[PDB]
């Protein structure tokens, strides 16, 4: 099998409501779509949703990295040899996990369609039957966050992820409000997106959250400070998750060496795709670190890819890919059974791409041969 052409689509996914977190507000979600063609007629779809604040990659930079740097060398290569494909991309350019992920996902889609098997059957098989879906609440005034939670509870949601990180006192008030409104039978996890910056602010914040039954605190400090995460962990009994601070095996090695976390948020966009994500899961398993497969808020394409990894591993105990539930328009048709997510048994990513929607959301594109 040989790659004959790679279509690149710079699209923008419309959000029902702006997604607001500690480091930024998103009115919509720019994404790069990959359509990989082969000499055998088998097509594969990939996606790269870049988050400037996490990996230093942007919508436009990713489009061009793919067009001028990554894809040229890929023409003629076999999508089935994923280890080789990744070695070639890594030898060509360091980092750029989001760009590499777009390629990796398309290769797996092709592999599954070629072998007529779901992607999860190719990376360990099916392990999970379903996962609960967690609703992510954007930053807002305490009462506003509490009201949205109540509203989503009527929709069937039983697990929430609270976005905080602007001011410790205010963040504590936000969390108290939500917990008070939903009761103690609703799951709540808190994501600071680096907002508390250091261990002192974090430990002070944690002093007021012990009685609120928080499942875990995610990335309270600046990404680069793994040392601070380990220090906080030595002084609190609340589970800690690292997100922005974990991208590749480089950071996983440090997290393990320093005992810096109880959980890690593995994301295809941070490590380079399905293949690197599986390696990270295997590394975390060695150290008994629980894993979650999150996302940058992606379309059905990358979201499906993430689930295929999650459903194939026992060490992955939670998932956070809800882009399709946030967008008013999607190029794929990944189906959710809120409050649960299950995967069908169709080939590859197991979804269908609406060509009309794809072109409708495309701002600019190119084809590399």
Ligand X SMILES: NCCCC[C@H](NC(=O)CCC(=O)O)C(=O)O
Residues annotated as catalytic (active site), given as ranges: 163, 191, 218, 243, 267
User: Least distance in Å: CB of 190 to Mg ion?
Assistant: 10
Q: How many residues bind ligand X (CB under 6 A)?
A: 16
Q: Which stretch binds ligand X (CB under 6 A): 196-204, 284-292, 293-301, 349-357?
A: 293-301
User: Least distance in Å: CB of 79 to a second copy?
Assistant: 9
From residue 2 to residue 41, the character string flagging contacts with ligand X as x (rule: CB under 6 A) and all else as - is -----------------x-x----x---------------
Helix (H, G, I), strand (E, B) or coil at 316: strand
How far is it, in rounded angstroms, from Cα 122 to Cα 173? 46
- Give the orientation angle of helix 274-286 with respect to helix 249-258, to 10 degrees: 10
| Range 164-203, binding Mg ion (CB under 5 A) | 191
Question: Are the CB atoms for 214 and 241 separated by under 8 Å?
Answer: no
Residue 51 engages ligand X in binding (rule: CB under 6 A): yes
Q: What is the DSSP secondary structure assignment for residue 158, as one 8-state letter?
A: -
Residue 343 pairs in a beta bridge with none
How far is it, in rounded angstroms, from Cα 302 to Cα 215? 26
80 annotated ligand-binding residue: no
296 binds, among ligand X, Mg ion, a second copy, none (CB under 5 to 8 A by kind): ligand X
The full length of the chain comes to 369
| Range 217-246, binding Mg ion (CB under 5 A) | 243
**Nearest alpha-carbon partner for 349 in 273, 292, 264, 247:** 273
Tokens encoding 25: 């507000």
Q: Cα separations (Å) of 255 from 159, 228, 280, 291?
A: 27, 11, 12, 13
Residue among 97 and 339 whose Cβ is closer to a second copy: 97
Residue 51 engages Mg ion in binding (rule: CB under 5 A): no
| Range 58-117, binding a second copy (CB under 8 A) | 58-61, 63-65, 67-69, 78, 80-85, 87, 91-96, 115, 117
Q: How many residues bind Mg ion (CB under 5 A)?
A: 2
How far is it, in rounded angstroms, from Cα 268 to Cα 24? 21
User: Least distance in Å: CB of 109 to a second copy?
Assistant: 15
Listed in order, strand segments (DSSP E) in the chain are 3-21, 24-38, 43-48, 131-132, 135-137, 159-163, 187-191, 217-218, 240-242, 263-266, 290-293, 316-319, 340-341, 362-368
Q: Which stretch binds a second copy (CB under 8 A): 35-43, 177-185, 204-212, 338-346?
A: 204-212
Residue 228 engages a second copy in binding (rule: CB under 8 A): yes
| Range 317-356, binding ligand X (CB under 6 A) | 320-323
Summarize as ranges the residues that interact with Mg ion (CB under 5 A). Answer: 191, 243
Summarize as ranges the residues that interact with ligand X (CB under 6 A). Answer: 19, 21, 26, 51, 136, 191, 193, 243, 294-297, 320-323
Annotated binding site: 26, 51, 161-163, 191-193, 218, 243, 267, 295-296, 320-322
């Amino acid at each position: 099998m040989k790659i004959t052409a790679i279509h690149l689509y710079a699209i923008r996914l419309p959000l029902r409501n702006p997604f607001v977190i500690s480091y930024g507000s998103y009115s919509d979600m720019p994404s790069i779509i990959v359509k990989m063609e082969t000499d055998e007629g088998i097509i594969g779809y990939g996606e790269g949703v870049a988050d400037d604040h996490v990996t230093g990659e942007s919508w436009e930079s990713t489009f061009h990295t793919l067009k001028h740097t990554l894809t040229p060398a890929l023409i003629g290569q076999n999508p089935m040899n994923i280890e080789k494909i990744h070695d070639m991309m890594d030898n060509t350019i360091y980092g750029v996990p989001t760009a590499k992920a777009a390629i990796d996902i398309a290769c797996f889609d092709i592999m599954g369609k070629k072998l007529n098997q779901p992607v999860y059957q190719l990376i360990g098989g099916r392990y999970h039957e379903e996962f609960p879906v967690t609703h992510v609440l954007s930053i807002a005034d305490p009462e506003n966050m509490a009201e949205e939670a109540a509203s989503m509870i009527q929709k069937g949601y039983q697990s929430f992820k609270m976005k905080v990180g602007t001011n410790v006192k205010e963040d504590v008030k936000r969390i108290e409000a939500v917990r008070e409104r939903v009761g103690n039978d609703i799951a709540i996890r808190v994501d600071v997106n680096q907002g508390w910056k250091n261990s002192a602010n974090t430990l002070t914040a944690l002093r007021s959250l012990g009685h609120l039954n928080i499942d875990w605190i995610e990335q309270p400090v600046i990404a680069d400070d793994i040392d601070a995460m380990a220090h906080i962990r030595s002084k609190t009994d609340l589970p800690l998750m690292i997100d922005e601070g974990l991208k590749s095996s480089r950071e996983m090695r440090q997290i393990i060496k320093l005992e810096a976390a109880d959980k890690v948020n593995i994301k295809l966009m941070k490590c380079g795709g399905i293949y690197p994500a599986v390696k990270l899961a295997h590394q975390a398993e060695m150290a008994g670190i629980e894993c979650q497969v999150g996302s940058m808020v992606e379309s059905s394409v990358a979201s499906s890819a993430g689930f295929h990894v999650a459903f194939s591993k026992k060490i992955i105990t939670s998932v956070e890919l809800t882009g399709p539930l946030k967008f008013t328009k999607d190029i794929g048709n990944l189906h959710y059974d809120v409050p649960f997510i299950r995967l069908n048994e169709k080939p590859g990513l197991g979804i269908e791409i609406n060509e009309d929607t794809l072109q409708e959301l495309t701002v600019f594109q190119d084809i590399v041969r």
